[PDB]
Subunit: 200 residues, 3 copies
């Protein structure tokens, strides 16, 4: 209704304890990576954030990950490090960051979370130092653009990465400090809400 | 009765997460191998084929394996790679290659499977390139010899390894292509069946 | 009553598959150690002996461990080696070495076990060769001192480590042979029992 979460979910899972010679290659795989985790899920950005958050709890890395709703192949040395990694992705997936509705009619959904310590997945899919804070904002395009601008007019932050909307949602990440990351966040959600009630 | 499978089974299992200094030695163990998998089973050849098939799914290798009905000690770096290995052996053991009866009286049992991509266990217990196809034929001695010959007179194949029968069954492996590996296979089973009905 | 065991127990557990950069450091952690096991328990000495006994079953080592009743952080390369390690600590904890009562009134408790092959935890918290036998004697202070002396007057053994009592119990370790380790052990328990009935 208001800002009620949207529990995302895990739809499939499977570990490949020892990726083929020929697969690791075509796949373009560091030598050190012979184990593999396949995770899929519904929300992309909420998985993106998991992939990230499991790059900190197991020595793993996101070999891959795009919107289908998703797929994230987590790479690691032995399986036991990609397990803990997957088992974490789930955990940050089944109960962590979540979209939210922006109207009551439940038909215009947004996403304002703060990543306080980027693991290696977004530090990198966004010109950043590993760990720097971040504001991951996802909303419908138009609802999106207007909200960033606001975002920005709200805190000393910068666009930390930005090809625009053309997810069928605009997403964007803003760094700066981390409180400022938060206000910006707040202000993103208000923007997007004034429009979902009355702009749109 | 006819060619009804003979489900083999797993009788025991145990991982040794960290083999003794002194055991690894007497055992003649590569340094890289400190974990160990003990598997036992009934059918030998069907385990042999598992040992093989788990050498492809976990970075493991068959440190050992002979007919007792069996024992296969799988070697690996950490345990988590010998687990996935054992868990696979089982899987290819509880539901994969299987002996079959050759008479109806259920008392003369054979084994004709095709290993399309040898892992490192048989490529090696048979002058071969790693992965080359293969025809693993097991049958009572006499039923055995007559059937190979046939085997051979059936497809362009070669004996890829062969000390003869003297398992209480003759076994033998034939390489060549892989279709030819199959006909040879077919022709092995017919041979062995004409005798189990009427030669024997 | 007499010498009835005192089952110790495991109160908490948790694996940290990938210890922080900054934690491993402050913690003073070999590079090779990125996985971590936290175990806690009631009896200290009985955990001490586990920590030890799991240093032999998984490639792990006791990064830490003191009396609180306890905490033992087990260090290892991947998690799969610290798991097997923890799972062993438990096993030698839930069913192995155990305190015992020394009176019937159940209020003066002792501990006489023989560690026949020290792993790396005590070989080292006691000038010893890795594996040398050992006699780990824990008893109330006074009950303690009198009993060692006896200990010693009983077998050719040596104090293998000794800051005295000031556990709220004196503990001490005696090496020598391993039978002699045992008599010494026996004689420690009698001593401590003559006093728990009548000295004390
Ligand atoms: Zn594991
Ligand atoms: Zn948030
Ligand atoms: Zn595992
Ligand atoms: Zn077959
Ligand atoms: Zn494991
Ligand atoms: Zn004892």
């Amino acid at each position: 209704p208001a800002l009620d979460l949207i529990r995302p979910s895990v739809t499939a899972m499977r570990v490949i304890a020892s990726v083929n010679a020929d697969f690791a290659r075509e796949l373009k795989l560091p030598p050190h990576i012979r184990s593999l985790g396949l995770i899929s899920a519904d929300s992309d950005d909420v998985t993106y954030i998991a992939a990230d958050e499991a790059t900190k709890q197991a020595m793993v890395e996101v070999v891959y990950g795009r919107s289908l709703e998703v797929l994230i192949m987590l790479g690691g040395p032995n399986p036991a490090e990609v397990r803990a990694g997957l088992d974490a992705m789930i955990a940050h997936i089944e109960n962590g960051a979540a979209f939210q509705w922006a109207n009551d009619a439940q038909d215009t959904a947004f996403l304002a979370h703060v990543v306080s310590r980027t693991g290696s997945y977004l530090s990198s899919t966004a010109g950043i130092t590993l760990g720097d804070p971040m504001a991951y904002l996802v909303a419908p395009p138009l609802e999106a653009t207007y909200g960033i601008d606001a975002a920005l007019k709200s805190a000393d932050v910068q666009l930390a990465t930005y090809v625009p909307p053309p997810t069928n949602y605009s997403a964007a990440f803003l760094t700066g400090s981390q409180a400022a990351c938060k206000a910006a966040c707040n202000a993103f959600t208000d923007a997007v809400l004034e429009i979902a009630r009355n702009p749109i």
